Design a binder for this molecule. Structure first.
Ligand SMILES: CCCCCCCCCCCCC/C=C\[C@@H](O)[C@H](COP(=O)([O-])OCC[N+](C)(C)C)NC(=O)CCCCCCCCCCCCCCC
Ligand SMILES: CCCCCCCCCCCCC/C=C\[C@@H](O)[C@H](COP(=O)([O-])OCC[N+](C)(C)C)NC(=O)CCCCCCCCCCCCCCC
Ligand SMILES: CCCCCCCCCCCCC/C=C\[C@@H](O)[C@H](COP(=O)([O-])OCC[N+](C)(C)C)NC(=O)CCCCCCCCCCCCCCC
Ligand SMILES: CCCCCCCCCCCCC/C=C\[C@@H](O)[C@H](COP(=O)([O-])OCC[N+](C)(C)C)NC(=O)CCCCCCCCCCCCCCC
Ligand SMILES: CCCCCCCCCCCCC/C=C\[C@@H](O)[C@H](COP(=O)([O-])OCC[N+](C)(C)C)NC(=O)CCCCCCCCCCCCCCC
Ligand SMILES: CCCCCCCCCCCCC/C=C\[C@@H](O)[C@H](COP(=O)([O-])OCC[N+](C)(C)C)NC(=O)CCCCCCCCCCCCCCC
Lengths: 220, 220, 220, 220, 220, 220, 220, 220
């Protein structure tokens, strides 16, 4: 099972770097010009380079929702799916842990914790997180799919830009927590789980809907 | 006709998400730093991920002008063209409806309504909207074309960047309403159709000119 | 000679739109947040969509320097090279003319005229314009080249990003006038040719050096 | 050995332009809106166009760490590795020298010198520089690798975006000196080597770890 | 009645300049950095210089609410109060008329029309306008009062800063229309009276409450 | 005791408006350009107009620390001091209550709650709050003092600018909570008293030190 | 005539410093956040400190228009008026000359030359400059007037804030050239007198109207 | 000599707070929007509140140059002048020491050290520092002077605004180090005395020239 564990470490390392570079760029070094575009591209380019790296071996899910979507899409065994989520959660905490150690406390903040924007209820926040992950999973499933007569497009860049779009929209509502592991890492390290179920229920449903809309309403 | 209706739902869903993520990022959460670059990339990355998703099944037109261009380009029957526009219009309203329900009223604004900039007449606004959609259709037609000895380039990223360019230029004039469905959704939900014909006449002509310049003056 | 004139109109139209969307985004609608990144991507995405459109028929030079480089690179007859430059110059003026007609006079400014930054001498400005066009031509020649065992990369996106890089650097010095036609259009329409030779000598030399460094010091 | 020296000049020229356009965009023409996103894309698009140019002949390492990684990865002889580093260091100094000559002294500053952010110790700065170069080398090694059944993606754009990500994160800590040559050029020309070993130890270790994690823990 | 009419022209001219310089600075020449602080000081310094000019002859009310407050405070006859309001309304329209003639149409906008912010109901907007004018009248009444043993403070600067405070707070809600004449001028010249009663009911009540809280609960 | 209770209502109303206009301007309507200067002037101009209004009757303390300082300075009986603090606390809650009712929930946030900046310990935060209130009380005591041969200066403007200075410095550390009532109002209405003792211990000590440094080390 | 020449040197020195600190702050060190508020306060605080310095001896006119207004107001002999204008013009050139020598050429620009904004005709620019100087002279005449029963207000701060208001409004139109000497200094040192008569005709008329409106329609 | 030492402690404490609040606001918490206006008002309002506090007892010099000017102006004995400078220097170090202890190391930076801007030579920097302190001393001497028939103006606000003007202009050149004590405090605590003589020679000469221009060329 050498090819199995190498993918688990790939999911561990890539999620570590995804959270490290993702949360790190999200750290408010400045209350100055709008960080939304910078952070959105950071998460996107982070996912783009990691899919380009470990995408051929683990799929570069780096997201319990994404792993949940392939589990729903019947493209991964239950066991491997639990293995990825643990590796993603364990890696996300590690990435935010190293980030906590290298970042000065004045700019660590709440470690880029996904908090609900004022005026955004948990019901509205859940729907936003559903649609954020729905399009994201839809893009992943349509991009990772090998069934098409055409042959064009970069996989890592298309999926990363879908994540960038999710942050260009969702950062104002929920901080764009389209990744339960990315949401779990600052919560576990700051002892703040306020409305944290939104960042699990939302993306998981959005992953399931994106896994279902594609498999039976877009490409049977 | 299973392959027919699946494309209609694809045009419905993708236009829904195109307007949801497009108008949502356009919502002025802040009168702060310039949102033009953020919104332009949002619309572009929104169209990029949707072409990457439903582009193989419906073409990912998500634009009555774009559907009008292929109708002019004789690459789609009249019936299917009317089906797409209804699906696009119905989907755009739905996307802006969900956006209205998840966005707090303080940041909904006019729901990112395409309004004419002061000092920009309806004649100047129409021309801007023509050239915005002309290059956009030109890019789509040159990108969706299968007739070339070369084999390179990502389809979804080229078309999305053409839409981004249109917003990098047209947002100052007309809000860059290169999509009558994207323009119809906030107008129907805010009861504001001021100069709304500009966002239909403009893109439709620009679509026809782009469909004609390509088919008979660029690639006969 | 049907295939000949269709490329001339392609060079005319694309340069028209290159200047229209390029200069238009460069128009200072606001002295607010830094426009450099917005304008740099605008010119780049403008060139990217135009190469994606008319690149298969005229090469999408839209630049007398670029046409000069292929003339130096012996990949185009003298006659066709003069035809392109006239079409580029004539198209650039037309693009800036339409832009002048659709843009309100309060935001037309000097029509995005390439002016030398204070403290930047004409000798320093020439060198900057040389290096701006040198890398730009180097990217074009390496990208348009068909001689390589590998097969990857998007042509239109690589060349457009090279132009974006040139504006990310050169806009502070000379406004990044890496295109004599783009520099000629506002000069002819504003009656301001101050230091205008810099935007011809600079890019032409940079085009020749880029055409020479590639053909005899990079890929013989 | 004609194919050998042509790669050395390629590493010399490309590093010259990498530092010229990289440091030049990093020059604080304005203490205004956040330059991080602009500079990050500048370095990335600079590396993207140079890989697109001289990548087929020298690999477009333009980085002693990257050359060190391939030396560790056993994909380059020791001799050629020393040749590249000298060409990179010599080219970086030349690029910053020309930049010094064309940039007015008021905006040269410290020539974009990689300085440690306050509150960031040399130990934290080293780790940040390790992870910056680790993912960067990981992306390069996974992208330059010819061993995969799939066939998609643009090489120059994936590696440049990895460098952009490194600056989107590392510019706040160390200025994102993921290139000892890019760090050596302003240090040698400003007589300021404060904490300069961090920008050599950091990237070199990060290059070795990225060269090792890929070759024996990701793709044996 | 020479001393009477000279005060009427003073109220006419000063309100003309108050609206001219007030609305003019409020004109969105740029969607860039936050204009709230600039506009708030503009209205304040406008009122400060006008009180310094015509304050000794008409009181420099330049506000139907302020004139209403002194009418409530029994410090002005009914007739003179109607004379001021007509002079203020007539002057405000004239000031916005000259501003319309000297400002290019691209930056006139809606002529700085006091519009209700999204999510701010007419009931909330009325209360904000009450408190804006309440403190403003309180400051005016306490400053114009001659009954105190102390002798210090600049009258024109204290009242202008109270108006500045009202815009520092109220511009986000209602545009800080603490002056029915300032609100009437763009409404009458743009044919837009949407929620215009809020900018009359609000300030008038706030003027009456400020005239009552001072005369019988602060200084009997 | 008519002159007694009228001062209590003055302390109630002015603190209500101080918190209403103070917290309201502090409400993050935009994560855009730096709000520090806007908020600092808002609190200052708020205190300036209120001292200009109710300063002759209650002293316009609107701050339990300021009332504590005069209690320490032996210029106010214990009873009246407790009366003011209750009126200030009761008024502050009322001001933030009305602000909560008129402000949309999307821009209410945490109601401008004084939170400690990351990296600022409670010991450092206390000292900052001491020095913020120390200079503030020093300015108040030196300004309210009637013992000097000179006769110049505006009282309300000098004290308000001292509060502005405190926010120009202290907003980055503790949000500049130089007023326990201003700090108590959002805490009691948001159920968040995290580190709230810092905003009481800090200002009270700073008030006592400022009351002591002036009375026995500056003006005996 | 010792008291005469000391006022001439006062007008020479103060205008020198008015232009030095005024134009210097207007020098675009950064195309970043809006400089209008910074420059407006700079000119205002510059005039405020100079009136506080040399106002008791020369009146601190530092403006040919202001000197023209007192010449119209019959408060100064013709001879002394010509003496001031020469001293102001000579001093303004000297102030901009020293500024030229101490400011690096990269940030000197056009030496803060009053240029007409695009879309602002010379007729509209003249009217703006009239109203800018009209209120400014009105404030000066009402502030320098000794005929009033009241006794309050700071002279230097009221006049400086009137100049600040003029720049808060006029900088977008004409750069707020309310001072022909301030407009003459960069024009004579840059050899650029384009539309320079606007900055003489405008302020002089505005000075005459302000000198007439005050003397015969405001305070006979 | 009780009245003597109380002024020394006043100069010690006020300079401590002047540097504490002055340098603290100058600390770059954010590389965002332009801090020049914020810092300029901070130093000004800091000096304004301190003159309002300890101005009646020590003069609130808080500046070795200002103390040097009164020593030149023959308004203070040599001994008292040395006493003030030691108290100012000792107090400045203490203020920056407390600031160092309360500010997190990530935002301490170089403790707001007055460094020369690139392209500004030590000769140009000296002249700028001369004119910065010259007008500042001129304002102080004209404001502290008791010889005038008029009676108006606030002393503390006029002098603080003169310091604000000096920072509105001088911060771009030298950081506006118009106070050798303010310049000495971060230099002694950061071990960085690069070009530190400029911040002593400059202000001292500017103080002497301002002390001489006033006493013998403005008010004999
Ligand atoms: C909060 C709690 C967190 C707890 C975190 C604990 C993480 C522990 C992770 C343990 C993973 C252990 C994996 C070990 C072996 C597996 O690979 C598994 C064993 O197989 P088997 O049953 O012995 O044989 C069947 C395979 N084959 C090919 C021989 C037929 N699969 C493989 O063979 C693949 C081997 C891949 C080896 C990669 C080794 C990397 C070592 C890096 C060391 C770095 C040290 C750094 C110190 C500072
Ligand atoms: C400031 C001064 C500016 C002056 C600008 C003047 C621009 C004038 C441009 C004139 C170009 C004229 C091109 C005419 C024909 C050429 O294509 C040339 C002729 O060839 P030949 O010698 O007759 O035959 C040998 C070819 N073949 C295939 C038949 C063997 N080549 C071709 O055949 C290719 C034909 C492509 C035709 C494209 C027609 C587009 C028409 C669009 C009209 C739009 C009107 C809009 C009004 C508002
Ligand atoms: C939309 C409709 C808008 C209509 C706007 C119409 C505005 C018309 C304003 C008319 C105001 C007329 C005021 C006329 C005289 C009053 O001063 C009134 C008369 O008094 P009485 O009954 O004759 O005598 C009892 C006074 N006394 C001292 C003699 C005992 N009071 C005075 O005496 C005060 C006189 C102040 C005169 C100021 C004259 C300024 C003239 C400026 C002309 C500018 C022309 C510009 C052309 C381009
Ligand atoms: C969370 C719990 C919050 C509880 C908040 C409760 C706040 C209740 C405040 C009650 C204050 C009551 C003050 C009443 C009278 C005092 O002025 C006190 C009595 O004196 P005495 O012992 O009867 O006579 C000795 C005085 N003299 C001159 C006659 C010799 N002092 C005075 O005389 C001064 C009178 C000042 C009266 C101001 C009346 C304002 C009324 C405004 C009503 C607004 C209603 C709005 C409804 C929507
Ligand atoms: C582009 C061409 C620019 C040309 C610029 C030329 C500027 C030349 C300015 C010359 C002003 C000359 C002023 C000379 C004297 C006047 O004060 C005039 C003479 O009066 P009178 O007729 O001799 O006597 C009747 C007066 N009293 C009291 C004695 C009864 N009035 C006075 O008395 C007031 C005297 C005030 C003297 C101030 C002297 C400052 C000297 C500063 C020197 C600095 C040198 C720096 C070198 C680097
Ligand atoms: C890096 C090296 C830094 C060294 C810093 C050392 C700073 C030391 C400062 C010492 C100042 C000593 C001042 C002592 C007394 C003077 O006031 C001097 C003596 O006069 P004389 O010769 O005894 O009598 C002639 C006066 N009279 C009226 C009685 C006729 N003048 C006075 O009388 C004015 C007295 C004012 C006293 C203010 C006492 C404040 C004490 C605050 C203590 C705070 C402790 C905090 C601990 C944490």
């Amino acid at each position: 099972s050498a090819s199995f564990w190498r993918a688990i470490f790939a999911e561990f390392f890539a999620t570590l770097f995804y959270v490290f570079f993702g949360l790190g760029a999200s750290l408010r070094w400045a209350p100055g010009p709008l960080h939304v575009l910078q952070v959105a591209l950071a998460f996107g380019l982070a996912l783009a380079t990691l899919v380009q790296a470990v995408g051929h071996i683990s799929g570069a899910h780096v997201n319990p929702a994404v792993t949940f979507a392939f589990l729903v899409g019947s493209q991964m065994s239950l066991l491997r799916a639990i293995c990825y989520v643990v590796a993603q959660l364990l890696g996300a905490v590690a990435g935010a842990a190293v980030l906590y150690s290298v970042t000065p406390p004045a700019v660590r903040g709440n470690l880029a914790l996904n908090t609900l924007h004022p005026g955004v209820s948990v019901g509205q926040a859940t729907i936003v997180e559903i649609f954020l992950t729905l399009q994201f999973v839809l893009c992943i499933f349509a991009t990772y799919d090998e069934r098409r007569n055409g042959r064009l497009g970069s996989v890592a860049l298309a999926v990363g830009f879908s994540l960038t779009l999710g942050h260009l929209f969702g950062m104002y509502y929920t901080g764009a927590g389209m990744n339960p592991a990315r949401s779990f890492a600052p919560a576990i390290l700051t002892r703040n789980f306020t409305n944290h179920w939104v960042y699990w229920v939302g993306p998981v449903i959005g992953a399931g809907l994106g896994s279902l809309l594609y498999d039976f309403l877009l490409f049977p």
